[PDB]
Design a protein around this ligand. Sequence first.
Ligand code: HXB
Ligand code: MG
Ligand code: MG
Length: 539
Amino acid sequence: LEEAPWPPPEGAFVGFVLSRKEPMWADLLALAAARGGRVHRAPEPYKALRDLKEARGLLAKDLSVLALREGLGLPPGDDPMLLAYLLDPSNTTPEGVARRYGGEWTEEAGERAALSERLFANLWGRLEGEERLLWLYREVERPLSAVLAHMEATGVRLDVAYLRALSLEVAEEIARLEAEVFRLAGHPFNLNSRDQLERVLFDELGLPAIGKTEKTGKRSTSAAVLEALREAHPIVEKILQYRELTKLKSTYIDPLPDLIHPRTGRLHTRFNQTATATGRLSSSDPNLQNIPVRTPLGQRIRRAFIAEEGWLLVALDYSQIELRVLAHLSGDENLIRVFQEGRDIHTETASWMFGVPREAVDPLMRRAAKTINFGVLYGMSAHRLSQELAIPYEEAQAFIERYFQSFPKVRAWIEKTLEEGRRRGYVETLFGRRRYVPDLEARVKSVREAAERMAFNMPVQGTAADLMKLAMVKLFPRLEEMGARMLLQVHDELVLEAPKERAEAVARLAKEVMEGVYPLAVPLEVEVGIGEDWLSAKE
DNA sequence: GACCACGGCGCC
DNA sequence: AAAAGGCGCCGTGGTC
Ligand SMILES: Cc1cn([C@H]2C[C@H](O)[C@@](C)(COP(=O)(O)OP(=O)(O)OP(=O)(O)O)O2)c(=O)[nH]c1=O
Ligand SMILES: [Mg+2]
Ligand SMILES: [Mg+2]
């Protein structure tokens, strides 16, 4: 490639080097561009940003986020990572994509710009004729990256002072619990080390080991094991409570406050677009898709996520969505009827599990029932199921058989999906997003059957994810015009931020965009709440 | 100071 | 732990 003075012609491909992986926190070390056998290197990266109309190339969204941070409206365009991910979702890094489609991910901006141009040419080649994947790239992924760049640059407000104070309280509680554990053990040890804890529990206290760890075959001290040992010794309960508190403290309460960005005063995650095997997004640095919600302390942490002053959060969450998707994909009449009658399978299982009326079921019960409903659907064993409901194995088995006989066509769809996956080497969502599952023909049963569970889950989970992505693409422009903001996506949920005066109107509109994203054989319903914090907005 | 594998566990 | 699927981050232990 011939050297050429900055700036590049229009439609050139950018390369850029960051001091670190997080766009919002990174120094832009270099910027380059390449077009028609040329490479232009920017003498000064930051100012050189101003000369671009579009971030076009590998990891375009990241450079776009960094541009937004500097007050520049530089939207992301074509990105070869998105083409590769669509061809095969195991294409998740530029290191791999480069090696696979004609180059090498280096640490120099010019070489990255050139790699972007080459990779785009080649990958675009692979996608000619793949009309459904092309529809996904133009109508969903490429536009979605623009939406994601904005969400990343916006961030969410956090109640820092509140978390600081909460930390001090939980610290004292943790001290009480570890002091108890050591007294019962008859000596101190690192309660954080599951190796040391294993020795205390199963060698010194001589408790019955229940399970082994996967890789190294040690005696497990997992929550499930400890739960089966609640009655066997007083120390077990204290260890479980200790685990809850230190998990929440070390993962959320302590780290989060230190991640408030100086410029924005807000908390910024990354929304990874080519990270999962099913087509879902992931979130990292920090992960804001796994903020606690289940337990009392978890809920207090969720309360820390608040709206800007004079604004409200709007939380919208698809109802029983993967079950609705499954009704459509499978064509099961009984299942479709359930949704056309406005029934609620999670609530129905909850009232059965806890032997209470439908009206007596609370949120924690329903959430319990959800892990049961999806667990069983995607292949949970009778033994495990019996352990979690704490019912006899025989009853666990009856639950699973009635579950599937209640919806006859589901098992048929599964078998059809696996057969097709064996012939073609891949399975696909409603929109033709693919996941290759070669192990469908493994000669080892356990490997083969693990692959089968991955294979028939993918169309379901991936269609739900397709729907949300499309809903976000349709929704974003409508929010901009109303002066509202899109903050987070948590798979089948969206968290927005609206001026108080317009929160109500924004909520109704978002609900309708999401419900009408793409009509199915069953209605899509969206539960929506409004509130000053994330907890309040979900009900 | 940085890797990693591992067990473990938070959420969807 | 166990035939649920999909993620990312924690501390420990071990290494470089
Ligand atoms: C808890 C859980 C979730 N999911 C999946 C399957 C599911 O449809 C979703 C897309 C969203 O989760 P959700 O909103 O909590 O639940 P629903 O949408 O089904 O119902 P509502 O409460 O919203 O009415 O992730 C699992 O695969 N395993 C799990 O343990
Ligand atoms: Mg939902
Ligand atoms: Mg949800």
